[PDB]
Design an enzyme around this catalytic site. Structure first.
Site, PDB file in Angstrom:
ATOM      1  N   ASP A   1      -3.547  11.513   0.868  1.00 48.97           N
ATOM      2  CA  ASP A   1      -4.301  10.657  -0.044  1.00 48.97           C
ATOM      3  C   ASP A   1      -5.705  11.206  -0.245  1.00 48.97           C
ATOM      4  OD1 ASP A   1      -2.205   8.893  -0.417  1.00 48.97           O
ATOM      5  OD2 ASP A   1      -2.842   7.551   1.209  1.00 48.97           O
TER       6      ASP A   1
ATOM      7  N   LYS B   1       3.908  16.389   8.141  1.00 49.78           N
ATOM      8  CA  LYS B   1       3.396  16.647   6.799  1.00 49.78           C
ATOM      9  C   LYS B   1       2.092  15.878   6.632  1.00 49.78           C
ATOM     10  CE  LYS B   1       6.617  13.189   4.826  1.00 49.78           C
ATOM     11  NZ  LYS B   1       7.508  12.884   3.669  1.00 49.78           N
TER      12      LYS B   1
ATOM     13  N   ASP C   1       9.365  15.530  10.803  1.00 47.60           N
ATOM     14  CA  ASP C   1       8.853  15.289   9.454  1.00 47.60           C
ATOM     15  C   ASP C   1       7.333  15.345   9.415  1.00 47.60           C
ATOM     16  OD1 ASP C   1       9.326  14.985   6.731  1.00 47.60           O
ATOM     17  OD2 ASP C   1       9.479  12.804   6.799  1.00 47.60           O
TER      18      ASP C   1
ATOM     19  N   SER D   1       5.326   2.572  -1.098  1.00 52.70           N
ATOM     20  CA  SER D   1       6.754   2.278  -1.095  1.00 52.70           C
ATOM     21  C   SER D   1       7.561   3.491  -1.534  1.00 52.70           C
ATOM     22  CB  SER D   1       7.064   1.076  -1.999  1.00 52.70           C
ATOM     23  OG  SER D   1       6.688   1.315  -3.347  1.00 52.70           O
ATOM     24  N   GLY D   2       8.787   3.598  -1.030  1.00 53.15           N
ATOM     25  CA  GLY D   2       9.679   4.678  -1.409  1.00 53.15           C
ATOM     26  C   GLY D   2      10.437   5.294  -0.248  1.00 53.15           C
TER      27      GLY D   2
ATOM     28  N   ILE E   1       0.813  -1.218   0.000  1.00 53.29           N
ATOM     29  CA  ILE E   1       0.000   0.000   0.000  1.00 53.29           C
ATOM     30  C   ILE E   1       0.848   1.272   0.000  1.00 53.29           C
ATOM     31  CG2 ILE E   1      -1.884  -1.158   1.211  1.00 53.29           C
ATOM     32  CD1 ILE E   1      -1.061   0.355   3.754  1.00 53.29           C
TER      33      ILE E   1
ATOM     34  N   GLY F   1      11.293   2.509   2.507  1.00 53.46           N
ATOM     35  CA  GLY F   1      11.028   1.109   2.213  1.00 53.46           C
ATOM     36  C   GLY F   1       9.590   0.893   1.769  1.00 53.46           C
ATOM     37  N   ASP F   2       8.948  -0.165   2.268  1.00 52.35           N
ATOM     38  CA  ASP F   2       7.578  -0.485   1.868  1.00 52.35           C
ATOM     39  C   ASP F   2       6.601  -0.459   3.041  1.00 52.35           C
ATOM     40  OD1 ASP F   2       9.383  -1.428  -0.154  1.00 52.35           O
ATOM     41  OD2 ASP F   2       9.035  -3.508   0.472  1.00 52.35           O
ATOM     42  N   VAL F   3       5.319  -0.310   2.724  1.00 53.10           N
ATOM     43  CA  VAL F   3       4.257  -0.460   3.705  1.00 53.10           C
ATOM     44  C   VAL F   3       3.227  -1.433   3.155  1.00 53.10           C
ATOM     45  CG1 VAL F   3       2.554   0.696   5.148  1.00 53.10           C
ATOM     46  CG2 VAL F   3       4.622   1.916   4.447  1.00 53.10           C
TER      47      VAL F   3
END
Length: 284
Positions: free
Chosen positions: A100, A142, A140, A25-26, A23, A29-31
């Site tokens: 989102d 945001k 961070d 990545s970047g 759901i 890493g990934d989620v």
């Protein structure tokens, strides 16, 4: 309690870290979205760059969000540190990130909801800055790091760059520049120092996103600041003003809070406690 989860569990719950459960990545890493063997709905973050940024971000979260619980912070339910694998497991937040919802697909957030998100996220941050000793500097903040649960309550996430600061200090000297384009406090570009007032600035940008409906990189901060002397009834999210024109007075007051948060001078910014008190005064 924070649980140590077996790696095999996370492996089968994500179907071997299959693309289907991915759901996001970047960078970090990934989620993955998953249901654990006990039925728990979770988000599983798989950190990359373990030989460097990976481990540091793992430790930052374990030392901060892993040690505290609050209604406006994402719950870290578990972790897995086997060999060079770094995984963090969170309660799944039904509606994903505020970014989102605001900048993709979806689900409509009227002003009432956005106001609650602003208050909730402010409370979470205030807890980090004032109720926690040592204080926690998120570094961070945001819109992608404000998650929304089933009740559209705001829950602050991603403590991968968070740091501990003694309550007897006004700032913390660090090794690197942390943050995200559009959210970085101007003084972070000039010195290797972070502070709670830094988080306040970044929170200000998020509050602007809620008021304008626009991305920070549209910067937005500069665009709003200049129109603050022009036409104020141009920057607000059109879908907010279409609801009730009477909300204009309330929007401008929240805008004032955001402007205060976004001051170039850290010493002039309010604390998140002042922000909360201001929100309370506006409602009354």
């Amino acid at each position: 309690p924070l649980r140590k989860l077996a790696f095999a569990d996370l492996l089968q719950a994500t179907n071997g870290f299959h693309n289907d459960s991915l759901i996001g990545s970047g960078g970090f890493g990934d989620v993955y979205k998953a249901i654990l063997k006990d039925g728990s709905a979770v988000a599983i973050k798989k950190l990359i760059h373990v030989s460097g940024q990976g481990d540091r971000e793992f430790m930052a979260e374990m030392e901060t969000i892993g040690k505290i619980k609050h209604r406006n912070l994402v719950p870290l339910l578990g972790y897995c540190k086997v060999g060079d694998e770094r995984l963090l497991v969170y309660e799944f937040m039904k509606y994903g990130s505020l970014e989102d919802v605001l900048h993709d697909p979806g689900v409509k957030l009227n002003w009432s909801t956005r106001r609650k998100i602003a208050i909730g996220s402010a409370r979470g941050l205030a807890f980090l800055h004032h109720n926690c000793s040592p204080h926690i500097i998120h570094r961070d903040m945001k819109s992608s790091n404000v998650l929304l649960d089933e009740n559209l309550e705001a829950r602050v996430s991603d403590f991968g760059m968070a740091r501990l600061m003694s309550a007897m200090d006004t700032h913390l000297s660090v090794s690197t520049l942390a943050g995200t384009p559009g959210y970085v406090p101007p003084e972070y570009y000039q010195s290797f120092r972070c502070s709670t007032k830094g988080d306040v600035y970044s929170y200000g940008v998020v509050l602007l996103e809620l008021l304008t409906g626009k991305r920070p990189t549209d910067n937005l901060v500069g665009w709003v600041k200049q129109h603050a002397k022009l036409r104020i009834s141009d920057v607000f999210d059109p879908e907010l003003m279409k609801e009730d024109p009477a909300l204009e007075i309330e929007l401008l007051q929240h805008l004032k809070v955001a402007v205060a948060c976004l001051d170039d001078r850290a010493w002039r910014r309010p604390t998140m406690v002042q922000v909360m008190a201001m929100f309370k005064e506006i409602q009354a």
